[PDB]
Amino acid sequence: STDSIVKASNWRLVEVGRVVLIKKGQSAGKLAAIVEIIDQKKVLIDGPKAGVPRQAINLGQVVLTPLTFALPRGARTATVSKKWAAAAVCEKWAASSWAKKIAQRERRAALTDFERFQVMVLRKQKRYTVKKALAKA
Amino acid sequence: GIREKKAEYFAKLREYLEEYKSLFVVGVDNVSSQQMHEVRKELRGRAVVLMGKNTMVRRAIRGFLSDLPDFEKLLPFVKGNVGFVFTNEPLTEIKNVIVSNRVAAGLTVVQVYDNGQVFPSSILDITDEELVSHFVSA
Amino acid sequence: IIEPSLKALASKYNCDKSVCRKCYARLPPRATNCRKRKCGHTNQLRPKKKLK
Amino acid sequence: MAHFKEYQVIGRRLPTESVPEPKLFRMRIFASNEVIAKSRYWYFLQKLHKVKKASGEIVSINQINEAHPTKVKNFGVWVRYDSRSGTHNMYKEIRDVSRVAAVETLYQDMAARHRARFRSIHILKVAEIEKTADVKRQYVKQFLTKDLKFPLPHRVQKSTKTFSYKRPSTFY
Amino acid sequence: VEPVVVIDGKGHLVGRLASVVAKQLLNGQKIVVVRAEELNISGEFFRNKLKYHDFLRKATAFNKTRGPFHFRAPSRIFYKALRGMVSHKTARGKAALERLKVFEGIPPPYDKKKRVVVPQALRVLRLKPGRKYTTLGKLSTSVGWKYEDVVAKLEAKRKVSSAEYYAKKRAFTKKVASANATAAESDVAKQLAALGY
Amino acid sequence: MKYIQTEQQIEVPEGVTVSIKSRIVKVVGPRGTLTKNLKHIDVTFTKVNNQLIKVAVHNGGRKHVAALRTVKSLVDNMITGVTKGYKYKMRYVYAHFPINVNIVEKDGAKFIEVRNFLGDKKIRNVPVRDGVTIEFSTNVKDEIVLSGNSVEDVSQNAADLQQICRVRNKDIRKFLDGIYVSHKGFITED
RNA sequence: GCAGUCAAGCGUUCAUAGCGACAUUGCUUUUUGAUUCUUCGAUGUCGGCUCUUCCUAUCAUACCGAAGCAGAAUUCGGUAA
RNA sequence: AGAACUGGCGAUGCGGGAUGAACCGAACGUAGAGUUAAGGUGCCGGAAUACACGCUCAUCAGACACCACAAAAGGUGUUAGUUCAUCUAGACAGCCGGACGGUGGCCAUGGAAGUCGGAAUCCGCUAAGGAGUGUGUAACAACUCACCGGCCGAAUGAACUA
C-alpha cells in the first residue's frame, strides 16, 4: 500500500509521573514514583502510599513499569500520594497480571502440607473433567 | 564600534520615530535596491525610510517605553523584511505612492502607526460609498 | 592531442593529491592527517610534486 | 575514600598570656570520619598560616547534614589537583542531590579520567546555583529540558541460577 | 538438578561458557553442547583469527606431530578452551570430560530433547552493543575446517522437521486453552485461586 | 559526554513507500524496489507519518552517533535512487592509443571489455552488476555512462573500471591514461 | 653495529625527493671490553667440510606508493623469510 | 667493586609472590576449634561472573611492587580540563533576500558589461556593497558570495594540557 511502514520498539520511558518497581533493599517488591531525574541512572522517587522514602537510587535495582501517571516535577511527597491515588494506580497495578503473579508465588510460599495435599487432589478432580471433556472435542 | 554601529542605527530610528508623526511599516520583501532607492526620490519630499535589523528595530523600540510609551505596539509588526516609511503627508497620498507607485508586484504597507493608533490599511483605501450608507441609513 | 579539461580531470585523480613525509600515501590535497595507522595519523604532509 | 561526610572544623593556635582569644579557623571538610577531618585541617592550616598540629587545638568538630537532600541540585566545583608532571586547576559540575555524593562521584571520575587519588586532590569550593543557564557544560544541560523523557534499553536479567530455559528478551 | 544438560552455544561466548561449564562437570553435572559452530567471540574476525595463527605455528620444533595438536573444529576449540580451564592430568579432570561431549549442530538422539542457555555467557546481555564479535564457524573453516556447508545443510533439514513439530504442538495447546477454560470457571478452580493456583 | 538523545529526520516523497522491520529496510518507488540490511547498528526509527521519518539514538557514545547521520544518507540515497535514479558519467582518455570498449555476455554475464589500453595485448574484463544500465555517448565523444538505483553497485562498477585501467611501472603524472569519472547525477532533474 | 626526533644548511629557486650540521632518545649482543657467577677430581679450548632449522635491520624474485621518475636506468619506502 | 645505620639469609621452615635463600606476612612442640594476615574470590583453586562511578577496542590490547624491561617526539583515535576570541544589539554553521547606482571605474581587442591579462581601491543612496570571491552566453539575459539583512536561536573556532 501507499502508506509507509515502520515498527518501533515501544519502550518504557523515564519521566516524572512514571511509576517504578523496587527490587532490592528494604523496599523489595514495593512501588514508587519519580519526582525528578538526575543523570542517566539516578533519580528522585517516593513511595508514600507504600511508605518508601523520598530519596535517590540507581536505576539498576529499579525496574520500570508499563504504568505511568501525570505529575508535576519536583512535587513534594504530599503532592505525590495526592496525584497518586487521584489516579488509583495501585489498583491499575493490581489489575495487572504482573502484580497477580507476585501475589501467587507468595501464597505458594505461605502454604501448608495439608493445603498442598488439598491442592494436589483438587487438580486431579479438576483434571478428570478435562479429559472426558478434551477427548470428545 | 560595531556595537556603536548598531547604536548608529538606533539613533536614526528614534530620530524618525519622533521627528515624524506617522510611519508606514512597509514590506521590503522583494524590493530591489533600485526599487528601495527610487522610493527615496519620490519620498524625498517628506518621507524618510529607515532600514536595519528587525532585531535592532524592536530592540530599539523596546527601549522607548519611558517616553513614547505607545510605541510598544510597533514590535508585533516588526516582522519579516518590513520597514518603516516615516512620513507626515496625508494618508491616501503616501499610502498610494508607497503601495501603488514604484511598486514591483513590491512593497505594501504592513502598518501605519501614529499617536498610539493602529490601522489595518483596508478602510484606509475607502474612497467613498462607506459614509453615504452610514449617514443615509442612520 | 590531449586536452587540459581531461587533463585536469586526470589531475584530480592522479596529481591533485598530497603525501606524507612518512606514510607515503597518495592522499587528498586538502587533507591534514594521514589515513594510515603505522605512521600514526600524523600531520607531516606535503603536496605531490607537480610534474616538471 | 568511603561514604563521605562533610565536617565543619574549627581550630586555633594555642593561646598564651601573649594572645588570649586567638583567631579561630573554620573549614568545610570531606571524608569518612571526624578523625581525618582533623588531619586535613592541619594539612591545610599549615599552608595558610604559621601553625601545626602541636601549636594548635580543635575547638569544635561537627558533621553537617544536608539542608535539602532530595532537592536535585546542579553542583559546580572549582578544583585543584596534581598530575605526574605538575599542578592543575579545574572547574567541573555535577547534577546530584548532596554535596557529599557529588564528591564521592567526583573522586571516582578524577580517578579514572586523570588518575588521581585522594592524596593528590584538593577540593576548593562547592556551590549550588540559583538559576539555570549559569551552567557551562553540556552533559548537565542535557537533563534540564522541559517535558524531558528518555528510555533505558537493553534491559538485562542478571540470573539467579546458572542455566535457563529461554533465550531472554530485553524489551523493557 | 538434572541428570544431563544439553546446551546450545548459539549466541554464547567461549570463555564465559566453558568456565561455567567446567565447574559443573567437576561437580558431576553431565553436560553436552550443540551448535558449537555458531559460538561467538569478542574482537573482529581478524584478531580472533591471528591469535589462532600465532597458536597455529606454535609447534614442537623438532617433530611437529608430538607438538600442540591444533584442532580447528569449533567443537575442539571450545573443548581446548574447556580443558585449559581444568586440571586435566588428574583423573578428576579426566572423568570430568567423559561427563562431557561436544558436537557441531544437534545430532538425532539430542535434537528431540531440550537444550538450554546460560545467561552469564550471552553476547546479547554480557557483551555491549557496538563491539565487534566473531563467529567460530567462519573461523574454523578459515583455518582448516571443511564442513560448514554440511552442517548448514544438515541443520536446515531438521529445522523443517522441527517447525512441523512446533506448529503441530502450538495448535494442540490452543486446544487445551479452550477446553480448560470451561473448567477454569468451576468451584474446583475457584478454590485453587484461593490457594495460589 | 554520552549524548542522551540525538535524532535526524528523513523525507519520503509522494507515490513512495518504505517498509522497515528488524532494521531490514525495503524501499519502493517508480524505478522499482530497493532492499537493505543494517543489523550492524543498534538504533531506532519512527514513522511519524507517511511523509516523514525520524532516526535517533538514545544514550550513546560518539562513534555510535555518526552512524545516525550516515543512515540518514542511505535511505536518502535509496529514496532518491528508486525515484530519480542515479547516473554516473565517465570519459575515456588517451593521448596516443585509442581505447576500444565493448559490452559482452557470457551466459548473459554482461561483461565490460577493454582493449588497446596503451596498445597492450591484454584484454580486461569488468562485469556489469544488476540494477545498473549502460549507455555509450553519441552526441558526445567517449562519454560512456552508467546509471541505476544502487549507488553502491554503480560507483563500485565505475571505480572497478577506473582502477583496472591504471598505469603500471610509469609516472602517472604524465601517463594520464585510463577511465575516469567526470560527472555523476540522476536520471531525473536533467 | 642499527634505527629514530628536531631543522641550520645542500639539493639551481625549496629544510625535509634524496640529503642532513649543532645536539639528542633509544635498540641488539653477530665487535671489542668491563666483572668473574658457574665450571680447574673437568663442558674435547681456531678455521674449513657436510647438514637442518630460525630471525629481519630484505640483496634478488611477487604486489605497491613517492622522486630533482619523460622512457630505460636508478634512489627512498611499505607488506613479506 | 667498596664503605655507613638498621633489618634479614647463612643457621629457618610456614602462607603468598606460579617458579624463586634474602620481598610482604609470620617465625614453629603434638592435636582440635574459632578469627585474621600478606595475597586474593571467572575456571584451573578454597572464596562475590558481588555491587557501584568512570576510561579503554589495540590488523602487536593490557592485566600489580623487588620482577624478569622501554624512551624520545607525535596523533581532529577518544575523554576531561585549562587560556583567548566571535556571537541575543540575532553570531557560527546551514538556508534565504540586494549582490545597486556616478557605473559597462581606466588600459589591453574582432568581442572581456564587477571575474584572460596591465594599471587605480574613489564616490552616492545606503541595513551593504569588493570599483567586486566566484558560475554562464559569441557578448546580454540568467545566480552565489564580500558587504549587508529575512530564517532556528546560541553555539562555534584557535593555541594548550593530562
Give all domains of chain E, ordered by start, each with its CATH number.
1-147 (3.90.1180.10), 148-197 (1.20.5.4280)
Give the nucleotide at minimum CA-to-C1' distance from C50. G67
Residue D46 lies in a domain: yes
Q: Do chains A and B touch (3 or more CB pairs under 8 A)?
A: no
Shared-domain flag, residues D108 and D63 = no
* CA–CA separation, C50 and D4 (whole Å): 67
DSSP H helices in chain E: 14-25, 45-57, 74-83, 92-98, 108-111, 123-126, 137-140, 148-179, 181-184, 187-195
Residue that is last in its domain, among D24, D46, D69: D69
Q: Please say whether the beta carbons of D81 and D75 come within 8 A.
A: no
Shared-domain flag, residues D133 and D74 = yes
Q: Please say whether the beta carbons of C34 and C41 come within 8 A.
A: yes
Residue that is last in its domain, among D69, D89, D120: D69
* CA–CA separation, A49 and A41 (whole Å): 24
Residue D62 structural domain? 3-69
R_g over Cα of chain D: 22
Q: Which of E188, E190, E191 to mutate to test the interface with A (most CBs of A within 10 A)?
A: E188
| Partners of residue A3 in chain F, C-beta under 8 Å | 17, 50
* CA–CA separation, B43 and B101 (whole Å): 11
The single-letter DSSP state of residue E147 is: T
Helix (H) or strand (E) holding A14: strand A13-14
Q: What is the CATH number of the domain that holds D28?
A: 3.10.20.10
Q: Please say whether the beta carbons of D70 and A74 come within 8 A.
A: no
Q: Please say whether the beta carbons of E120 and E46 come within 8 A.
A: no
Q: Please say whether the beta carbons of B82 and B46 come within 8 A.
A: no
Give the nucleotide at minimum CA-to-C1' distance from C19. G66
CB contact under 8 A, E116 and D157: no
CA separation, residue B10 to residues B28, B54, B56 (Å): 19, 11, 7
CB contact under 8 A, F17 and A40: no
Give strand pairing partners of D124.
none
Helix (H) or strand (E) holding C10: helix C4-14
- For the domain bounded by A13-95, which CATH number is listed? 2.30.30.30
**Which residues lie closer than 8 Å to F114 by C-beta, 6 or more apart?**
F99, F100, F101, F123, F124, F125, F126, F164, F165, F179
b/e F15-47 (16+ beta carbons within 10 angstroms → b) = ebbbbbeebebebbbebeebebebeebbbbbbb
Helix (H) or strand (E) holding D31: strand D25-31
Shared-domain flag, residues D78 and D101 = yes
Q: Nearest residue to H129 (CA, C1')? A: B33
Q: Do chains A and D touch (3 or more CB pairs under 8 A)?
A: yes
* DSSP-derived 3-state class of residue A5: strand
Q: Please say whether the beta carbons of B116 and B70 come within 8 A.
A: yes
Pairing of strands F52-58, E100-102: unpaired
Q: How many helices (H) and strands (E) does chain B have?
A: 5, 5
Number of other CB atoms surrounding residue A88 within 10 Å = 11
Interface of D with F in 146-165 (CB under 8 A): 150-154
* CA–CA separation, A29 and A20 (whole Å): 10
Of C2, C10, C48, the CB nearest to F180: C10
Give the nucleotide at minimum CA-to-C1' distance from E61. G53
| Partners of residue A122 in chain E, C-beta under 8 Å | 188, 191-192
Residue D159 lies in a domain: no
| Partners of residue A80 in chain D, C-beta under 8 Å | none
b/e A3-27 (16+ beta carbons within 10 angstroms → b) = ebebeeeebbebbbbbbbbbeeeeb
Shared-domain flag, residues D120 and D135 = yes
Residue D162 lies in a domain: no
Residue D163 lies in a domain: no
Residue D161 lies in a domain: no
Give strand pairing partners of A44.
A36
Closest-CA distance of chain A to residue F50, Å: 5
Q: Please say whether the beta carbons of A74 and A115 come within 8 A.
A: no
C-alpha cell at F169: 611501472
Q: How many helices (H) and strands (E) does chain A have?
A: 4, 6
Which residue of A lies nearest to F25 if distances are taken between CA atoms? A6
**DSSP per-residue string spanning A108-120:** HHT--HHHHHHHH
Q: Please say whether the beta carbons of A115 and E195 come within 8 A.
A: yes
CA separation, residue D66 to residues A52, A73, D4, D73, D167 (Å): 20, 21, 12, 12, 46
Shared-domain flag, residues D50 and D100 = no
CA of C43 to C1' of H114 (A): 40
**Which residues lie closer than 8 Å to E110 by C-beta, 6 or more apart?**
E6, E32, E34, E103
Shared-domain flag, residues D76 and D64 = no
| Partners of residue E129 in chain F, C-beta under 8 Å | 42
Sheet with F111-115, side-by-side order of all strands: F100-104, F111-115, F124-127
* CA–CA separation, C26 and C15 (whole Å): 9
C36 touches strand G (CB under 7 A): no
Using alpha carbons, select from B30, B21, B36 the residue that is nearest to residue B98: B36
Domains identified in chain D, total number: 2
Q: Do chains C and D touch (3 or more CB pairs under 8 A)?
A: no
Residue D164 lies in a domain: no
**DSSP per-residue string spanning chain F:** ---SEEEEEEE--TT-EEEEETTEEEEE-SS-EEEEE-TTS--EEEEEETTEEEEEEES--SHHHHHHHHHHHHHHHHHHHHHH-EEEEEEEE-SSSPPEEEEE-SSS--EEEEE-GGG-S--EEEE--TTEEEE--SSSSS--EEEES-HHHHHHHHHHHHHHT---SS-TTT---EEEEEEEEESS--
CA of B94 to C1' of H98 (A): 24
List chain H nucleotides near protein: any atom < 7 Å from a Cβ.
42-46, 49-55, 57-61, 73-83, 87-90, 97-101, 124-129, 149-151, 155, 161-162
> At residue F187, what is the residue type?
I
Using alpha carbons, select from D142, D80, D143 the residue that is nearest to residue D110: D80
b/e B76-88 (16+ beta carbons within 10 angstroms → b) = ebbeeebbbbbbe
| Partners of residue C13 in chain F, C-beta under 8 Å | 162, 178, 180
Using alpha carbons, select from D47, D62, D44, D49 the residue that is nearest to residue D14: D49
Angle between helices A113-136 and E148-179 (to 10 degrees): 100
Determine contact: D172 vs chain E, CB below 8 A.
no
Residue D157 lies in a domain: no
Give strand pairing partners of D25.
D11
DSSP H helices in E33-107: 45-57, 74-83, 92-98
Residue D171 lies in a domain: no
Q: Please say whether the beta carbons of E65 and E39 come within 8 A.
A: no
